[PDB]
Paper text:
Microtubules (MTs) are important components of the cytoskeleton networks in eukaryotic cells, responsible for cell shape determination, intracellular transport, cytoplasmic organization and cell division. A pf is formed by head-to-tail stacking of αβ-tubulin heterodimers. The GTP bound to α-tubulin is buried in the α-, β-tubulin intra-dimer interface and is non-exchangeable and non-hydrolysable, whereas the nucleotide bound to β-tubulin is exposed to solvent and exchangeable. A tubulin heterodimer with GTP-bound to β-tubulin is termed as GTP-tubulin, while that with GDP bound to β-tubulin is termed as GDP-tubulin.
Numbering used by the authors:
A (entry chain D), B (entry chain B): 1 to 44, 47 to 360, 369 to 436
C (entry chain A), D (entry chain C): 1 to 36, 47 to 432
Write the structure that this text describes.
Amino acid sequence: MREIVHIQAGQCGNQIGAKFWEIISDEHGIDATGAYHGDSDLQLERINVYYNEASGGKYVPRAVLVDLEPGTMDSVRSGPFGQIFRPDNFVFGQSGAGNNWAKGHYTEGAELVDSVLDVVRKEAESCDCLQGFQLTHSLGGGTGSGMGTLLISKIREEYPDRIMNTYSVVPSPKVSDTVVEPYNATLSVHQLVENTDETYCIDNEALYDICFRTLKLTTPTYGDLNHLVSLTMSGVTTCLRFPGQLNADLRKLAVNMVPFPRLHFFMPGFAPLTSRGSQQYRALTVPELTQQMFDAKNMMAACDPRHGRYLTVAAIFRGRMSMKEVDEQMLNIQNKNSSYFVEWIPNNVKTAVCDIPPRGLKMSATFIGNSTAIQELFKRISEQFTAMFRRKAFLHWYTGEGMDEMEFTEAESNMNDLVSEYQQYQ
Amino acid sequence: MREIVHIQAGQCGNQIGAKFWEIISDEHGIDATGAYHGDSDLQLERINVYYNEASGGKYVPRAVLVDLEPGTMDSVRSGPFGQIFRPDNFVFGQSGAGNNWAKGHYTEGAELVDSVLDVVRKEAESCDCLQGFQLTHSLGGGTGSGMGTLLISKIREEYPDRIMNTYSVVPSPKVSDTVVEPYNATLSVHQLVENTDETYCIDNEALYDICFRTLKLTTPTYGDLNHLVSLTMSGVTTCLRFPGQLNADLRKLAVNMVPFPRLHFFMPGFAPLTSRGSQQYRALTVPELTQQMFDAKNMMAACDPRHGRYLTVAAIFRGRMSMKEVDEQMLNIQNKNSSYFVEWIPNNVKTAVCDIPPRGLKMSATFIGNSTAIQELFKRISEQFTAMFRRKAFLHWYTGEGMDEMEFTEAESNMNDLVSEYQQYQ
Amino acid sequence: MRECISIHVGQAGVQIGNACWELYCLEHGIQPDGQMDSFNTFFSETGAGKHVPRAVFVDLEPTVVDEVRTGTYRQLFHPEQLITGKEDAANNYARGHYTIGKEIVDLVLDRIRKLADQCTGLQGFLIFHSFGGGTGSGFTSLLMERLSVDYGKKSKLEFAIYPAPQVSTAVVEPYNSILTTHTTLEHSDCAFMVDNEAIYDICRRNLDIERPTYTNLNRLIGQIVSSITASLRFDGALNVDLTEFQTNLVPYPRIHFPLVTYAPVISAEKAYHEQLSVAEITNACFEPANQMVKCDPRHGKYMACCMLYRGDVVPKDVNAAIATIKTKRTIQFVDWCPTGFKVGINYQPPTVVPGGDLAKVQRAVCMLSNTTAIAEAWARLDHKFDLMYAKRAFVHWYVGEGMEEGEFSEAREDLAALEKDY
Amino acid sequence: MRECISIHVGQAGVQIGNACWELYCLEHGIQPDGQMDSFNTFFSETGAGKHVPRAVFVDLEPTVVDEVRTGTYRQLFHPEQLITGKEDAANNYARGHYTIGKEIVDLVLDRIRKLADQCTGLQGFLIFHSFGGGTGSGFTSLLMERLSVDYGKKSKLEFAIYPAPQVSTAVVEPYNSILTTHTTLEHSDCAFMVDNEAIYDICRRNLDIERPTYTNLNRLIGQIVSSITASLRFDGALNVDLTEFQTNLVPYPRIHFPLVTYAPVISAEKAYHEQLSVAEITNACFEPANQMVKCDPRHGKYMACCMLYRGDVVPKDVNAAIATIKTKRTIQFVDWCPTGFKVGINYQPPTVVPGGDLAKVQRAVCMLSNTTAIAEAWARLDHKFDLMYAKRAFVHWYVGEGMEEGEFSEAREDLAALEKDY
Ligand SMILES: Nc1nc2c(ncn2[C@@H]2O[C@H](COP(=O)(O)OP(=O)(O)OP(=O)(O)O)[C@@H](O)[C@H]2O)c(=O)[nH]1
Ligand SMILES: Nc1nc2c(ncn2[C@@H]2O[C@H](COP(=O)(O)OP(=O)(O)OP(=O)(O)O)[C@@H](O)[C@H]2O)c(=O)[nH]1
Ligand SMILES: Nc1nc2c(ncn2[C@@H]2O[C@H](COP(=O)(O)OP(=O)(O)OP(O)(O)=S)[C@@H](O)[C@H]2O)c(=O)[nH]1
Ligand SMILES: Nc1nc2c(ncn2[C@@H]2O[C@H](COP(=O)(O)OP(=O)(O)OP(O)(O)=S)[C@@H](O)[C@H]2O)c(=O)[nH]1
């Protein structure tokens, strides 16, 4: 019943997916092994969406792990909840792209592609009905972006019907983690624009800002950031996986949030996110979340929406709401924030509610915004690519691996077309 | 319901605000943490005017703390009732204006202004209806006066509807606490006259005189002074916060006591104020208070009203009175003190009574006076400014921070115009 | 059947209405819950043995209305007849007429409309408010013109707490009084002036109460209104209708400001030594100091008089006393009104409230007179306006609410015309 | 005997059906097991003392239907009536009309066919759905054309949840609403609009509920449907049949969108001190703000009105109230329809659901009016379409499901023709 395949690439993607799997197991009350230990029937009512039955009353996640090095997958296997995965699902190479898109898409990916397509086909056909695919990777690294692009290409030419979303981690503008990250970003975007239905942009610098200021934590770690992204993912999927007073699914979000085929890049946001002390000084009410809902500080995307305009907005809530108040709250947001909202989309706010709240929180919300702020980000990458292409810096690695200057020219042309369309619709 | 935002600046402002918050919590029956422990329903009937209902039978004050140094706010946090405040509401600088208005308004205020406006907008919109803003600061210091002027300017250009009152502490004429205090006073007054609806003048020397003579205490402390100012503030607001046989609010006082938009400076007064042994030698009757309210000794403004004339007088009372007696008493005051009262304002006395007496006193009264005595104060300041401007003493600090001699000239011209208007209306 | 609709505006209106409703409920034996024929004239019986007054309480601030909600009579009033605002006019007529009233007048209009739809013999409207309060002037005037344009010739009575020449809480009372009087002159059929200082003096010298609160004043006002309404709520030898009040005491439409007086106002200990006669109470009532308006009627004249006796008073006795006092030279009457009297005898003794300052007695009289002394105060009031307008004091406050500076002068000259009409 | 067939499409249909059937089972004393004569009109007694509703639940997503399977009324339905899809239309009328509905409409067609074969006096069909929901538009349209072509002139009733102009969950609501309205315009015998924000308001400031959930909305909707069907399920002075609604409230076949109103809407706390008569409830119902459709009828006119009074109401009182309101100028009727009134009196008091916001009362009125102001909203809705079509936004989504760009334009011009028909 609308089963979902989980695929992760690169160290970042694999760690985030691991965190997401622990979060999902916590939500469904599954032990560290896989045995069912839920407290309500609704926990197992849609358990098959992210799990498959196993003899002995066990449950195995519907996940596939992909890498070009056997280290981070080994760490995931040895990490917490390492026994929930069935070992046969793991697939990895032996070379390592080494932060090179050409290596991760044409030389070292051409051999792992067959295995990963075989395993994803096995997962698809062995299930009842595949609603879609959720992917987890980053556009900066080599194997991550290249493998993600290859998989989305093959899946799209294989399943032109099911919708897939990519939780790609945009490279942080504040530090160029990889010197060749503009090239990887450009190529990954040039593939995602056509071969992926929609994307969510998540930045490490915004996560750091939230952890230091909003969460007020002195020692941020990758675990906490992965936890936040996993909470966002679980909140997105809870509408499908749990009953709601106003239910929704992935297709509802795709239809609501996509006004044009190529304008499918979104900003995720979460609330509430309070430190240890402030939790007892906030009335856990819907207004307390709507005041934390529309502002640049709470958006984990490195782009200020106030400069641009919101094309569309979606809000998924979890808990005990009298959502006529939510409706009038969205009306007030439209009223006072009319400047930031687009004009030719009347009532551009979509709202949905899921009954069961996430574990540990009586009530929460999640924000999915399509706006023109990301354009800036995109725009920036453009010139950086140019800044690293006019001098022909680091072109030897890509040129020797089978790429071409015409390939980069076409990718940059399409990228500039995308940013121009975003600016035009402002 | 007519919620009020509390903002404090500088060491004096923060300490007075802290004392005021303990006084209010005592009045509303709030424990040392914030849990409700009132004895009557009327305590929680209007509790929302100065509090917000946190989750789990908890109340947090509607307060904002602003400073350019992180020290005195730390003392507030560690002081009594330190846990009642919401920790995130605290806003602190890192430089310190150092008794420099230019530093506190152009150099170091330009970065904290964004945060303080953000938090004040948060408090305003998170509430139902914001009746007005009450501030607490001192014009002698640098960060206090500068931050207060910046906040009033931003609020006035943001909310031109809600009246705000400032409990500014006038610099003491008897000692020049800081050599540059005339400049700060002049600039702060020049901003207040245009961007503040009313102001109360309170001088430390008058409080010392009351403590030594009227209160008969051997060792005055800043705690007692802040306690008296807080008692005055609570007596002013008890008309709004508690039911009264003749109710009143801030707008009533503003309309009654303001004959002209620019002549909006006031004198506070409190009664009864007796030593330990005197309480058993004076009856707690209304005449015993009316004899105590009308005298230069009990005015916390360093200026004798007998030299000038009373433009308007407002009197708020608390306790068990048959206020027709208050009416005939005000008639006696008008009759005998006819010389000290203005002639072209028939029945220049406003009167109001609040049912609930202050904690610890069965019956009390508070006095708000608009008169021409404060003129002398302002008048005096002018010469000091001139005496400190012809020699160009200490002009380097303000000149280097972006100000100008023309700015001081315009401020002095406005001050002279204001004092001339007060003199002309005598 | 012959119902009447009550309106209370401002804090004074709310308190007076509370006292009046408790007094009537005690008179008819109505419990604070609402349980136990003329009661139908003021209280609708709904469902079974339950009764609710036909009252509307409105204010721009929620304090007094909320206090009423928490009062013992909460079980009496149905919840939504009580109206609350957010910002009070704050002794500003413009604030209560243009800022807040212009968007909340429709609420009270709908309330009175639904009250009038279930009443078929509506005699008229009663309004209680205060000139000094911004709400009680502005919103009163606004709803009053709405009622007038929705009803035309329907009778309306006004109970205005006229601020004293020296007891006036708001220093800006002359501005609001002049503006609201200009606004209400044309359509208010009959307004009754009441002086707070006069009530204070009467209570302290006659009832011998040193320290009375507003509770005693409200008791007196409720007794006055009960004496007025006893004709409709009880049978009598000569019942008087509300329309007859505006038929008698209005020689010309302009001058419609009659004052009121009560008798007797004595304590129980005084009541032991005093036996009631129609002549004694009538001459005491005609004594100038017994009036609750600080004006000497002998400084002017008399245009009309209306005695309301309640209890067991023989009509011959009333006629004898009235004729004898008419023969007295102490009070002068205007030439063109030789017969300007009206007498209403009712068989209901005045109601006594427990703990009340008034003592239960068999006979009582309420007097209504349209004397000429009232203009005196008006002139003085107009003078006050001058002293507060030559310097243009407080003008900016009303300018900020949307007024026009010319309206002040227009109201001043209009009230000067009203004064010189005498 | 005189059975009626219920159909519920989409999540809104499923929830409304759950509430309405629990209300009916409470009304007849039906246990959740189905045990315990007019009940035969909705529940088929089969086997032994076991009654099952004639209800069909259909949805493209198995969430709400499965929740019904796990509900307290699980054993009330024989498990074959509940229908589940696999993929929801996801706020896409094209998806619910062409992709999935085209191959699953036959299942529900067979279900309703075998339900109708065991009924001999089938009056008609009630259909519940929402315009905004993709399922509630597409599948409703498809099933409704199937019913129309399989039955011709058989009466059909539509209970549509008209999305509010500003309270609309799906941002693509205008496209689906326009498409489904064009597609069902020809066959729509009589469709009822319901604007969610209007129910929110009516609940919040009449029932004084600060935070209501769809539970209370469903309670009100079930009460409305019970009031409509009480004529068939109970006796009265003047019973009304389902055909009579489409006979009366359809001046012309094109304009068949009447709105609905209910009265009273109060809690027991107000109900203690309030009585009920035909006049008060009727004039409250005729008040525009009491309508659960966000329009001001005074902006337009009235073509027909049908008031169902349930309880113990005297017909003479109904006639007097209706005539008096007809004399009132506040409501204007079209010239060529001077007599457009229908009155149905039923002796069954309105059933109160345990824990429900509504308070049990003796009298209740449900009003169904055809006003012109509805066209206003349609025009506004059409305007929204332009604002979302000039840029061709979301066009690709519907193109992917097999739509043609000409369908949008033809639907837009068709609804423009509908609007200018007024
Ligand atoms: N005699 C008498 N007068 C009262 C009583 N209560 C209030 N008043 C009068 O009311 C006046 C105050 O003005 P209000 O009408 O109450 O003002 P408000 O109710 O706050 O309305 P706004 O002025 O618009 O804010 C005083 O001058 C009193 O004379 C009462 O119980 N008895
Ligand atoms: N008034 C009211 N409206 C409801 C209720 N439940 C759902 N709705 C309406 O349903 C709309 C949401 O779309 P649905 O009708 O549920 O569509 P769906 O069931 O998801 O089917 P698809 O759109 O094809 O996916 C909202 O706009 C609500 O107005 C309810 O209980 N009461
Ligand atoms: N949020 C989050 N981001 C991470 C985490 N770990 C790495 N990243 C981000 O991922 C980006 C690098 O992606 P990465 O997966 O390491 O590239 P790769 O191609 O897989 O690298 P390799 O396997 O060829 S060696 C960096 O920008 C880094 O900030 C993590 O645990 N959480
Ligand atoms: N009444 C009262 N006055 C105080 C108190 N503390 C300081 N003051 C007064 O405040 C004035 C100085 O203001 P202050 O707040 O210290 O300036 P500042 O600009 O904030 O100083 P800084 O923060 O830059 S270091 C002095 O005249 C002093 O008398 C107090 O506790 N009670």
